[PDB]
């Protein structure tokens, strides 16, 4: 049950996906501007 929280969908898996995307769109912005 390693990805059990995001494989089940639901609020705790949809918030995890949103948090991941937020962090990495931030990092992709601060990685592209530094290119």
């Amino acid at each position: 049950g390693a990805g059990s929280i995001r494989e089940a969908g639901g609020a705790f898996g949809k918030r995890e996906q949103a948090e991941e995307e937020r962090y990495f769109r931030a990092q992709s912005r601060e990685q592209l501007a530094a290119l």
Partner: protein, 466 residues
């Protein structure tokens, strides 16, 4: 045509005719019985043998006993003489008030109205119940279905609808008790007498009563809904009247079929149900309809086995209703009564062109905020209330206020709560929910909306609490 019994298995009787095999659906009278034992023909088995379903208990039946063919299906008296009377599945009076002296009898088996006899008008039927009026309004001449498990409030709701709609009704009304408590029938009879709706002294009664209850064998429980249908059909077709038809419980009809489907020698379907479940239900339900010769508004209570809403019987009944009120045990255990599930009850007049754009928008906003709260439930349940945004906290507060405001004290429920029953008009309901949605009561405690009528009583209760 005289036949003889060759087999008896529970409620199913195989009868053997030498001359004159009777058609299917005929009524046969067993000879040598104290009370009238009627068998309805269901199958021709070949070899001049028919299979039949008994309308009463089959104890004491012997192989070789004689049976007479009536020549027609079960015929019940229909007419204004059935008003204020109680009849059983085969039309006998069971109120000890003597015979029912009608001028005409109708077979309880008839074809549904044609496609060209249908009516399309969709006036709204205001009941005085906030959740029903707002989210899933009933329609005049429509089909209402109250779903719910055991002990969630189907009978309280149907008696509140009898109290609100049937009392001030213009036309007639028929109540068919199908597989329910006999003491509930006694309660309803004596309550309709003490309220003057049934008049034992003249011809002013306005309600007919048919009853085959949970003590009756499966054949009577299978045909008593048809008997009630027949009375209502007479009052619709042959008098042009606007009829109310209350059925409780319609599920029992289906259930009774199951009990005989095994004995009729049919391969079972899913959940052990008769393979003919949907066709039997449709054959019954298409007679419960409005035509252009008269209107029938039908309130049917539908039992949900083991609270399983996907059970074949309720899942098949869903497609026959114009408006559905789905009661919930989870909502009832929170203390919200009626336990109507706001995110599961629907109606076909919930269309802005029918209810007005204001009503439509208020109902849609209520459902949207309740759905948002339902989405937040998980994060609320594990991480608690503190981890929500301020907008999430605001929508949770408003959604809980709306939840409590959907509850309402019933006039028929005073006797076990003491609180007087409130009857909320439609405009008051729209206004109160509009104001809770706009944010005009974000300061009142959420327990001030619980078990009140209009929003003014909520403000008064909030004051009294402080």
């Amino acid at each position: 045509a005289t036949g003889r019994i060759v087999a008896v298995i529970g409620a199913v009787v195989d009868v053997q005719f030498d001359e004159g095999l009777p058609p299917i659906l005929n009524a046969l009278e067993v000879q040598g019985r104290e009370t009238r034992l009627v068998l309805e023909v269901a199958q021709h088995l070949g070899e001049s043998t028919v299979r039949t379903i008994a309308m009463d208990g089959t104890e004491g039946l012997v192989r070789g006993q004689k049976v007479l063919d009536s020549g027609a299906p079960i015929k019940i008296p229909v007419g204004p003489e059935t008003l204020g009377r109680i009849m059983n599945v085969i039309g006998e009076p069971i109120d000890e008030r003597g015979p029912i002296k009608t001028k005409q009898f109708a077979p309880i088996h008839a074809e549904a109205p044609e496609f060209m006899e249908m009516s399309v008008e969709q006036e709204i039927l205001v009941t005085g119940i906030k959740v029903v009026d707002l989210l899933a309004p009933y329609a005049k001449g429509g089909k209402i279905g109250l779903f719910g498990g055991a002990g969630v409030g189907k009978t309280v709701l149907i008696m509140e609808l009898i109290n609100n709609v049937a009392k001030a009704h213009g036309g007639y009304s028929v109540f068919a008790g199908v597989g329910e408590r006999t003491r509930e029938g006694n309660d309803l009879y004596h309550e309709m007498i003490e309220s003057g709706v049934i008049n034992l002294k003249d011809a002013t009664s306005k309600v007919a009563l048919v009853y085959g209850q949970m003590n009756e064998p499966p054949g009577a429980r299978a045909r008593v809904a048809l008997t009630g249908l027949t009375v209502a059909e007479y009052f619709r077709d042959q008098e042009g009247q606007d009829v109310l038809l209350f059925i409780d419980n319609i599920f029992r009809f289906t259930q009774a079929g199951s009990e005989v489907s095994a004995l009729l020698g049919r391969i079972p379907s899913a959940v052990g149900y008769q393979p003919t479940l949907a066709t039997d239900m449709g054959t019954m339900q298409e007679r419960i309809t409005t035509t252009k010769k008269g209107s029938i508004t039908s309130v049917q209570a539908i039992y949900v086995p083991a609270d399983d809403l996907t059970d074949p019987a309720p899942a098949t009944t869903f497609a026959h209703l114009d408006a559905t009120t789905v009661l919930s045990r989870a909502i009832a255990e929170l203390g919200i009564y009626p336990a109507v599930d706001p995110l599961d009850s629907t109606s076909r007049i919930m269309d802005p062109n029918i209810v007005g754009s204001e009503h439509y928008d208020v109902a849609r906003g209520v459902q949207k905020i309740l759905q948002d709260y339902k989405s937040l439930q998980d994060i609320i349940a594990i991480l608690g209330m503190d981890e929500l945004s301020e907008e999430d906290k605001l929508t949770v507060s408003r959604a809980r206020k709306i939840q409590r405001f959907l509850s309402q004290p019933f006039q028929v429920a005073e006797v076990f709560t003491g609180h007087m029953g409130k009857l909320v008009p439609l405009k008051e309901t729209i206004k109160g929910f509009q104001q809770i949605l706009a944010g005009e009561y974000d300061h009142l405690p959420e327990q001030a909306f619980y078990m009140v009528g209009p929003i003014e009583e909520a403000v008064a209760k909030a004051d009294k609490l402080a």
